[PDB]
């Protein structure tokens, strides 16, 4: 599985593949790994459909819990801390094999510069966080391939459209070199999911828009 995230001028985009494996066997082809967690954030977890939907569900509950109790949303630093705590609280279960590494994408509505208000935060085994200053990041079994792809393609990111294209291509490159990451299935019509976040909030990118970009990448390579 591979999850990518990148900053574009005015926002951030996060995308993830749809595969699930039980060793060598493909156990799922429709898995959703990227979820909108509140109006300005999205989390992607490299793993099973449930440990991705249950982690995102709990974090979403935690964030909205604070908002209702206090009247205002948590600060982005606050959102990071809460996620870090959740991951750290799963360290005892991560020594068995139940590892879940999240990637957080968000837009800081309180940032000075709206152009660079997109945020990408990655977490390690211990529950340690790092706010990425390089522009892009990826987690999962195909992350090295996706990061190396974005390294060559990032200069082409100028807006939301080009950013989403680079994200989909990175995920394509991940699936091309990693069997645990699923590429776009033109036969069944299953494509990577994506979330785009700007000053107007977090929006699920429609399947049709990704399908158009997938076909363009395929047609560009043959």
């Amino acid at each position: 599985x591979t999850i990518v995230a990148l900053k574009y001028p005015g926002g951030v985009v996060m995308a993830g593949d749809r595969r699930s494996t039980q060793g060598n066997m493909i156990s799922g082809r429709d898995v959703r790994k990227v979820y909108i967690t509140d109006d300005y954030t999205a989390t992607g977890i490299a793993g099973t459909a449930a440990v991705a939907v249950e982690f995102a569900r709990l974090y979403a509950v935690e964030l909205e819990h604070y908002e209702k109790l206090e009247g205002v949303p948590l600060t982005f630093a606050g959102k990071i801390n809460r996620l870090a705590i959740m991951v750290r609280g799963n360290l005892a279960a991560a020594m068995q094999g139940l590892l879940a590494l999240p990637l957080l994408a968000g837009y800081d509505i309180h940032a000075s510069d709206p152009q660079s208000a997109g945020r990408i935060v990655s977490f390690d085994a211990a529950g340690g966080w790092n706010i990425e200053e390089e522009g892009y990041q990826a987690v999962g079994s195909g992350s090295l391939f996706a990061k190396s792809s974005m390294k060559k393609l990032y200069s082409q990111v100028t807006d939301g459209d080009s950013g989403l294209r680079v994200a989909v291509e990175a995920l394509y490159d991940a699936a091309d070199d990693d069997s645990a990451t699923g590429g776009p299935d033109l036969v069944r019509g299953i494509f990577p999911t994506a979330v785009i976040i700007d000053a107007d909030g977090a929006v699920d990118v429609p399947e049709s828009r990704i399908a158009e970009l997938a076909r363009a990448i395929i047609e560009s390579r043959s």
Binding site: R57, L58, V61, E64, H65, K68, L69
Partner: protein, 154 residues
């Protein structure tokens, strides 16, 4: 300090039930029930009873059709099901009578706000706290009507 305590406990209750079962498993009836049980225990167990009067309201889910539910929970744990309006605090009778008369079932937002403000006045601007449970919103129905919007409304 007493009703904010209750407000927090309700959110605590609601979020826990919704996580243990699912979001569509939390209702106004459930919350009114738990406030009745809490206020009833306070009235009996604690030294000083809570000097509060609560209202729990529920609207239908998006694209669903159901009449709004309004519940009044009093200091002793008594729970009443009101079908049209709830008046709490201060001098209740002049406000309750001004509503029972100037009532408008299926009224507009602009109309219902005027029918309400006046009643509040009978009992006794930015001197108001207004909000709605907007049945038309996808998930979170609660929306505050503040400042210019509130001003625009008047």
């Amino acid at each position: 300090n007493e009703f904010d305590n209750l407000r927090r406990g309700g959110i605590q209750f609601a979020d826990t039930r919704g996580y243990a079962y699912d979001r569509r498993d939390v209702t106004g009836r459930q919350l009114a029930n738990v406030y009745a049980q809490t206020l009833g225990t306070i009235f009996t167990e604690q030294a000083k009873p809570y000097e509060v009067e609560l209202c729990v309201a529920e609207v239908a889910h998006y694209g669903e059709t159901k009449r709004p539910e309004l519940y009044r929970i009093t200091y002793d744990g008594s729970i009443a099901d009101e079908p049209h309006f709830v008046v709490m605090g201060g001098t209740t009778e002049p406000i309750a009578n001004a509503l029972k008369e100037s009532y408008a079932e299926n009224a507009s937002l602009t109309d219902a706000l005027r029918i309400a403000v006046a009643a509040l006045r009978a009992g006794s601007v930015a001197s108001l706290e207004v909000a709605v449970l907007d049945a038309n919103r996808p998930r979170r129905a609660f929306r505050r009507i503040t400042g210019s919007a509130l001003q625009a409304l008047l």
